[PDB]
From Swiss-Prot:
Enzyme Commission numbers on file: 4.6.1.13
UniProt xrefs under InterPro entries: PI-PLC_domain, PLC-like_Pdiesterase_TIM-brl, PLipase_C_PInositol-sp_X_dom
A Gene Ontology BP annotation from the UniProt entry: lipid catabolic process
Protein name listed in UniProt: 1-phosphatidylinositol phosphodiesterase
Key words of the record: Lipid degradation, Lipid metabolism, Lyase, Secreted, Signal, Virulence
Species annotation: Staphylococcus aureus (strain Newman)
Pfam families (alphabetical): PI-PLC-X
Xref: Gene3D superfamilies: Phosphatidylinositol (PI) phosphodiesterase
GO molecular function list: phosphatidylinositol diacylglycerol-lyase activity; phosphoric diester hydrolase activity
Length: 304
């Protein structure tokens, strides 16, 4: 049966000799925003309706955690200025729970500063994450701490791999974990070397695009991935787009079009390499339409 038939443990069915970069991985954009209930706010600030555990059950393996330092020992999960009602510990604990339940999966956790620190804060965002989370004995063994820039599934399964969107860091394991960090171009499709030249990161993150331009930018990077068997190359492709347009169109509304359009394209490509595709409303189904998370999972080729 289809891998998308067992989303809760799909990675367990792959050759663990694969480099994570080579795996087609569904991600959720602003993963933590499922806590939002305020309907006026949710139009533009809510990007998911499944909680973290349910997103994992649904096969999501890449988490977009954007944060704000709200005390010298605390990072709160945020969508820009909007507080998402929990701290990073909650994500970590859920991840840790899911990984012991499904220990042949790995999670890639992207970490970004999304808003200015609370005025009492005396430490940088990167220092707080490094000291109060990554290095914290409480989360001992949860993070990938290997020295490989291009780790395999074997060496990462059971753990969270950092995907560093903080800037330069003194953390030494994970994507962009060095004193340069990742050069991220605003609202752009771009390409930049990371991990001291070891990896070429190719990103589509045109989050302010109107609809047609967004779909075209998702497909342009999709088409590139399909031609590229290089493991030293990493694709991150965000289908998520910012709210606005003809009425005051929600992030959901756009996801209801983009997700099925890309799901279908991938399905028609069969087993082509896709890269890591980051979506809004991961796991949200619409009768009659292909499901993006499911098609990303199924696009992985089992050759072993």
């Amino acid at each position: 049966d289809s891998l998308s038939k067992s989303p809760e443990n799909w990675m367990s069915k792959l050759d663990d000799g694969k480099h994570l970069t080579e795996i087609n991985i569904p991600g959720s954009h602003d993963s933590g925003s499922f806590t939002l209930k305020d309907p006026v706010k949710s139009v533009w600030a809510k990007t998911q309706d499944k909680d973290y555990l349910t997103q994992m059950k649904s096969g999501v393996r890449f988490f977009d955690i954007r944060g704000r330092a709200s005390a010298d020992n605390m990072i709160s999960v945020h969508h820009g200025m909007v507080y998402l009602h929990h701290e990073l510990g909650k994500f970590l604990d859920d991840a840790k729970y899911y990984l012991s339940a499904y220990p042949n999966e790995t999670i890639v956790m992207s970490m970004k500063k999304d808003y200015d620190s609370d005025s009492k804060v005396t430490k940088t965002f990167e220092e707080i994450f490094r000291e109060y989370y990554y290095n914290n004995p409480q989360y001992q063994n949860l993070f990938y701490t290997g020295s490989n820039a291009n780790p395999t599934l074997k060496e990462t399964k059971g753990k969270i791999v950092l995907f560093n969107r903080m800037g330069g860091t003194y953390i030494k394991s994970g994507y962009g974990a060095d004193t340069s960090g990742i050069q991220w171009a605003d609202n752009a499709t771009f390409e930049t070397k990371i991990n001291n030249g070891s990896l070429n990161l190719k990103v589509q993150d045109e989050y302010k695009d109107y609809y047609d331009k967004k779909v075209e930018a998702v497909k342009n990077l999709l088409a590139k991935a399909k031609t590229d068997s290089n493991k030293d190359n990493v694709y991150v492709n965000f289908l998520s787009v910012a709210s606005g347009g003809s009425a005051f169109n929600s992030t959901y509304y756009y996801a209801s079009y983009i997700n099925p359009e890309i799901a279908k394209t991938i399905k028609a490509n069969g087993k082509a390499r896709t890269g890591w595709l980051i979506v809004d409303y991961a796991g949200y189904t619409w009768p009659g339409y292909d499901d993006i998370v499911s098609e990303i999972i199924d696009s992985n080729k089992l050759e072993h």
